[PDB]
mmCIF file of C-alpha atoms in Angstrom:
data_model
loop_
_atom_site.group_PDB
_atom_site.id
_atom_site.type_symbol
_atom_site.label_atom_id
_atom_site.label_comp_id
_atom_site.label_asym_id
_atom_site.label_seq_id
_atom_site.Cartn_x
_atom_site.Cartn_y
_atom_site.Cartn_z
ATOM 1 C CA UNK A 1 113.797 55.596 110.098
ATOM 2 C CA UNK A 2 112.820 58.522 111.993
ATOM 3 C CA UNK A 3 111.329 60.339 109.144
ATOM 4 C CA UNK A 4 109.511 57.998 106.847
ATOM 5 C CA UNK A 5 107.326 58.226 103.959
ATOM 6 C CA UNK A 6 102.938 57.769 105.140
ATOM 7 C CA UNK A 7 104.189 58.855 108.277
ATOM 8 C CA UNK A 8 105.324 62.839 108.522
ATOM 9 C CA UNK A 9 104.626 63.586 105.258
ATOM 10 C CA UNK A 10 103.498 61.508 102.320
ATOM 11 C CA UNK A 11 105.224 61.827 98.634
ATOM 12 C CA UNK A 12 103.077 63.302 95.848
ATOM 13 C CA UNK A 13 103.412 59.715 92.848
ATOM 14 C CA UNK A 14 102.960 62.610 90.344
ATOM 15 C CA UNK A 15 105.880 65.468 90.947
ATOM 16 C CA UNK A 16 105.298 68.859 90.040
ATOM 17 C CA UNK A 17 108.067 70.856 88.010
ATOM 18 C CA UNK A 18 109.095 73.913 88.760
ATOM 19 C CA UNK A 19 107.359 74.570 91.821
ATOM 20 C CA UNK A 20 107.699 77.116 95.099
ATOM 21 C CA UNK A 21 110.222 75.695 97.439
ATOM 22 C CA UNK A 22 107.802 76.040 100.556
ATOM 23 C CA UNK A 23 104.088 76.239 98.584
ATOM 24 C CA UNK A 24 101.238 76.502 101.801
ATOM 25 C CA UNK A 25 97.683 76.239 100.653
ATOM 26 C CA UNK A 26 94.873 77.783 102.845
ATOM 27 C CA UNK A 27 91.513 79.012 103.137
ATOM 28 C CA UNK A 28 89.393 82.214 105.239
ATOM 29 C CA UNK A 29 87.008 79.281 106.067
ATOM 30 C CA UNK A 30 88.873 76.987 107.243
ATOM 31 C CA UNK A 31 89.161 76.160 110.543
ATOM 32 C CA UNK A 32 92.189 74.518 111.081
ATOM 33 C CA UNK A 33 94.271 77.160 109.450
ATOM 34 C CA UNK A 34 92.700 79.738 111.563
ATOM 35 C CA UNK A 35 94.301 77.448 114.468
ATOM 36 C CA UNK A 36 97.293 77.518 112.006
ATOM 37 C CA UNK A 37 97.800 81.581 111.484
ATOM 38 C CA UNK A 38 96.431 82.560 114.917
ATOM 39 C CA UNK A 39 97.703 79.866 117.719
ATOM 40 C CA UNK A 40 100.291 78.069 116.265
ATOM 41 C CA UNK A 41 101.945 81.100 113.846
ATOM 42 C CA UNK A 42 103.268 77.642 111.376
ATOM 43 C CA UNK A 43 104.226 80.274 108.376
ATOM 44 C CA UNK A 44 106.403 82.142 110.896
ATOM 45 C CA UNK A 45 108.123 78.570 112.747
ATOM 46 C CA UNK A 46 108.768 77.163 109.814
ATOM 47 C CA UNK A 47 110.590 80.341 107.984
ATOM 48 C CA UNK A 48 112.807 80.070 111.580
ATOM 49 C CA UNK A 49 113.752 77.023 110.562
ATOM 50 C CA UNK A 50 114.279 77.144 106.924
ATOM 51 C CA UNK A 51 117.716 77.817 105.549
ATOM 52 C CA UNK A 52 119.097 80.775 104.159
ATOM 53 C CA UNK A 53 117.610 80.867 100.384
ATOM 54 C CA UNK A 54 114.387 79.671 100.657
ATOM 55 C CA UNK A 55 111.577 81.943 99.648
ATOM 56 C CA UNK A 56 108.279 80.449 101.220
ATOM 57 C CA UNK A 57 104.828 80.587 99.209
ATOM 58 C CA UNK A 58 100.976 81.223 100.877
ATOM 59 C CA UNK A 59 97.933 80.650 98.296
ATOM 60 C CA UNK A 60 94.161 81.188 98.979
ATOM 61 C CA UNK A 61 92.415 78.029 97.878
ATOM 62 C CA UNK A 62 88.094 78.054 95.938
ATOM 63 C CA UNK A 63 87.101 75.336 97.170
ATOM 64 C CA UNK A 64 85.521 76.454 100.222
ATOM 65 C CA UNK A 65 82.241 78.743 100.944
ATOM 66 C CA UNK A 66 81.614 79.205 97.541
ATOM 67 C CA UNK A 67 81.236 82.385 95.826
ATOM 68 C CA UNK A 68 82.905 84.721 98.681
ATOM 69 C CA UNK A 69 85.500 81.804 98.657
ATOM 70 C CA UNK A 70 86.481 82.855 95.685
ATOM 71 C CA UNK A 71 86.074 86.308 96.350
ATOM 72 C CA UNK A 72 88.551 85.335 99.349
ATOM 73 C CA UNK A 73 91.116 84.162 96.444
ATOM 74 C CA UNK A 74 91.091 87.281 94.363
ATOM 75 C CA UNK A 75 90.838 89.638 97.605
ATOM 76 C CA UNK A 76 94.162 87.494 98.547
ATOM 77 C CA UNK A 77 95.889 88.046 94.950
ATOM 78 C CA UNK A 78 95.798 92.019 96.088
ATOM 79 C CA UNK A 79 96.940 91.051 99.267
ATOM 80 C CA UNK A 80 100.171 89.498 96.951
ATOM 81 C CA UNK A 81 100.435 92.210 95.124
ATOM 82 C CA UNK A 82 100.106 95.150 97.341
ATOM 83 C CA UNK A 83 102.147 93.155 99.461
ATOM 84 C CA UNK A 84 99.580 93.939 102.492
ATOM 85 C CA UNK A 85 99.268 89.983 103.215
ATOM 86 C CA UNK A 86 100.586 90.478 107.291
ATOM 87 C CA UNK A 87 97.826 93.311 107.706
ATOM 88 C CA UNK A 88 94.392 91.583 106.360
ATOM 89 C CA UNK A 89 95.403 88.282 107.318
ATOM 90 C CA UNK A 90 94.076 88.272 111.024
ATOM 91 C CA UNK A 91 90.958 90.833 109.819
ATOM 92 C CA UNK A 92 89.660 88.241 107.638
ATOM 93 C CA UNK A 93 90.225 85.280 109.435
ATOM 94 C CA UNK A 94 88.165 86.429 111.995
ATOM 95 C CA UNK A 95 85.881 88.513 110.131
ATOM 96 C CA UNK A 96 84.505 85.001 108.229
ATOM 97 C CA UNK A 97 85.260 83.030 111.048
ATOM 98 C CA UNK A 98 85.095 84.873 114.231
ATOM 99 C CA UNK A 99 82.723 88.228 114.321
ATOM 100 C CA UNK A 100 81.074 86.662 110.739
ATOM 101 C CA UNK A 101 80.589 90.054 109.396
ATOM 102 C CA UNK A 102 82.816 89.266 106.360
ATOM 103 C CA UNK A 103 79.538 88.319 103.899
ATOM 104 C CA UNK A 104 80.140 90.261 100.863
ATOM 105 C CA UNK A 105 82.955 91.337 98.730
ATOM 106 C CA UNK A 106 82.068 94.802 100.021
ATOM 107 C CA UNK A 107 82.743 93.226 103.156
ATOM 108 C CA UNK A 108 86.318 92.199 102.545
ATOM 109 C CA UNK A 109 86.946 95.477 100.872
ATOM 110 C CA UNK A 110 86.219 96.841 104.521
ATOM 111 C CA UNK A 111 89.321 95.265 105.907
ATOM 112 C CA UNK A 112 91.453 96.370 103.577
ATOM 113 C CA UNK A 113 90.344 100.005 104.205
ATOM 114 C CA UNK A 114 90.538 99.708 107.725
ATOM 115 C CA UNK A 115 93.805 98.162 107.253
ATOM 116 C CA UNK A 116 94.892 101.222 105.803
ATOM 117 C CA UNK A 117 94.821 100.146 102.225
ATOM 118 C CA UNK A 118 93.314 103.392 100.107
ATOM 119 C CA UNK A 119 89.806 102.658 98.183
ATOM 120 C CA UNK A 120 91.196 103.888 95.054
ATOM 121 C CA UNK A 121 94.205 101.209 95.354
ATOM 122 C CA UNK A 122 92.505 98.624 96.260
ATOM 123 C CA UNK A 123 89.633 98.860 93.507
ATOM 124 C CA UNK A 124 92.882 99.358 90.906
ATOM 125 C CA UNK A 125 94.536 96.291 92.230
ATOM 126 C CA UNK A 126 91.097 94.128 92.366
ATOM 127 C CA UNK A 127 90.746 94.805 88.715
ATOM 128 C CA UNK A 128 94.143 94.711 87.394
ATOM 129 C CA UNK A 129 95.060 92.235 85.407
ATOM 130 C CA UNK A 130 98.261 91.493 87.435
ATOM 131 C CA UNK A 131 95.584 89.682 89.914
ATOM 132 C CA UNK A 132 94.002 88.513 87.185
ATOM 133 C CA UNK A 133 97.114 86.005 86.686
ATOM 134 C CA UNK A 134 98.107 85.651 90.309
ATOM 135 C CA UNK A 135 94.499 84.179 90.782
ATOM 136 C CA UNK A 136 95.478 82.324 87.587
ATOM 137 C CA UNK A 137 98.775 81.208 89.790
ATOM 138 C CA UNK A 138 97.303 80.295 92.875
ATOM 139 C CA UNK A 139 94.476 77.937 91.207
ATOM 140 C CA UNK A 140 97.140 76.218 89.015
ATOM 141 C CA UNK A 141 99.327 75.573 91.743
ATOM 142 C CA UNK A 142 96.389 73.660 93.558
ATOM 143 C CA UNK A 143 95.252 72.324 90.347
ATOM 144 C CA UNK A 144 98.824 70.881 89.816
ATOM 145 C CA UNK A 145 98.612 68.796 92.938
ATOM 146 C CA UNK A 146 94.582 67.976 92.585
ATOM 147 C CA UNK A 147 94.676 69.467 96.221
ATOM 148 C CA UNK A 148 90.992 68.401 98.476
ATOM 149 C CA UNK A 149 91.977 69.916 101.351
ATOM 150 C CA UNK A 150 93.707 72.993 103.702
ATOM 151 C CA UNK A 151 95.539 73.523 105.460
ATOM 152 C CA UNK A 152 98.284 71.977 102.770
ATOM 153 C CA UNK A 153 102.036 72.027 102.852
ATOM 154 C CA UNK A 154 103.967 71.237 100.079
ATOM 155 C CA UNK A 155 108.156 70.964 99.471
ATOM 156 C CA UNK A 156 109.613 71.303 96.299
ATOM 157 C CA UNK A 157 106.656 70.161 94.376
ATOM 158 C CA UNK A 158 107.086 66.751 95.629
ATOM 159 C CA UNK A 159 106.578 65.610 99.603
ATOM 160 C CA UNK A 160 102.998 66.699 101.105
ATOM 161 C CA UNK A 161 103.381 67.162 105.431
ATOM 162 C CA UNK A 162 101.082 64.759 107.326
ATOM 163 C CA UNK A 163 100.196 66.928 110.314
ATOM 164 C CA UNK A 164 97.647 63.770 111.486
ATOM 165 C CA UNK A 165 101.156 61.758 112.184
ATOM 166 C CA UNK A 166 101.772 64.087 114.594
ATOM 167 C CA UNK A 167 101.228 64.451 118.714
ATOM 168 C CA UNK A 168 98.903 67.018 119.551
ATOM 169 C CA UNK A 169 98.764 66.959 123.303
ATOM 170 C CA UNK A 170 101.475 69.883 123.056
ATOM 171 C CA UNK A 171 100.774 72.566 120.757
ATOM 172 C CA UNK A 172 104.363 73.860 120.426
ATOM 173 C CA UNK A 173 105.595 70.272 120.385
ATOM 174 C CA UNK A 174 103.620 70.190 117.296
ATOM 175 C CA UNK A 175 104.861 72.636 115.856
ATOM 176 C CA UNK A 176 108.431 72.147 116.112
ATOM 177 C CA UNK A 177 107.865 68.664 114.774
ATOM 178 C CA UNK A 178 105.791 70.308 112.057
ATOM 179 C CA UNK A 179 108.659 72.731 111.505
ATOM 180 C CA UNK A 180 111.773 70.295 111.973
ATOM 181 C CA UNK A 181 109.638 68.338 108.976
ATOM 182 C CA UNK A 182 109.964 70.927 106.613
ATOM 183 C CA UNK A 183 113.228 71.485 107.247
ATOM 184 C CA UNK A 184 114.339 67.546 106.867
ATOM 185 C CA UNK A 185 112.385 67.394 103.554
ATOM 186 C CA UNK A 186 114.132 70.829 102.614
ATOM 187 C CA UNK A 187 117.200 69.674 102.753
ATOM 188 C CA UNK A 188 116.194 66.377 101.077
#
């Protein structure tokens, strides 16, 4: 076929129930989803492509740099909740992996307040227990698909995309491919 199985995307043996139709895991540290938000906008393609009905799910991943990678995760839950995610996204991408002057919480606190995001609200939301259980959401969610590595795409709890099946020579041939993918397993 065209679109086969170990090829654009792999199938998960163990299904998840219940699960975001589009569920994309990243992280501030890593490099290819930097690539991913900043050069090849893959969120944005793929909602283009999606049909009408499909909400589409980004979570912040602890498995990389540590302690402010976890920071990273909660910082990411106020992000959800504020609903300030298209604002801070670029900031801290290239605050950890651009400028590197993201090295503290403090420090991610700063791009939220430079964002426009008041002190006051942001220390509320960082301390809230509503982020207290979407932190609880977004490590479940990788937990549920023993997820090693980011930038990770995910439909309907049950096909992974295989981005290394892929041509790279073209960068927006990739990601129409990449796009056209989730859309064929969508609809699957």
């Amino acid at each position: 076929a065209q679109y086969e199985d170990g090829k654009q995307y792999t199938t998960l043996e163990k299904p998840v129930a219940g699960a975001p139709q589009v569920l994309e895991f990243f992280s501030f540290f890593c490099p290819h989803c930097y690539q991913f938000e900043e050069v090849l906008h893959i969120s944005d393609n793929v909602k283009k492509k999606l049909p009408e009905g499909v909400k589409m799910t980004k979570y912040h991943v602890n498995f990389m740099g540590g302690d402010l990678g976890k920071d990273l995760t909660q910082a990411w839950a106020v992000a959800m909740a504020l609903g300030v995610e298209d604002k801070v996204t670029v900031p801290l991408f290239e605050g950890v992996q651009k400028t590197q002057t993201i090295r503290s919480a403090s420090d991610i606190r700063d791009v939220f307040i430079n964002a426009g995001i008041k002190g006051e609200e942001y220390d509320a939301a960082w301390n809230s227990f509503v982020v207290k259980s979407l932190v609880a959401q977004q490590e479940k969610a990788a937990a549920d698909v023993q997820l090693r590595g980011v930038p990770a795409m995910f439909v309907n709890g049950k096909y992974q995309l295989n981005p290394q099946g892929m041509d790279t020579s073209n960068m927006d041939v990739f990601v129409q491919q990449y796009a056209d993918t989730v859309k064929y397993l969508s609809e699957k």
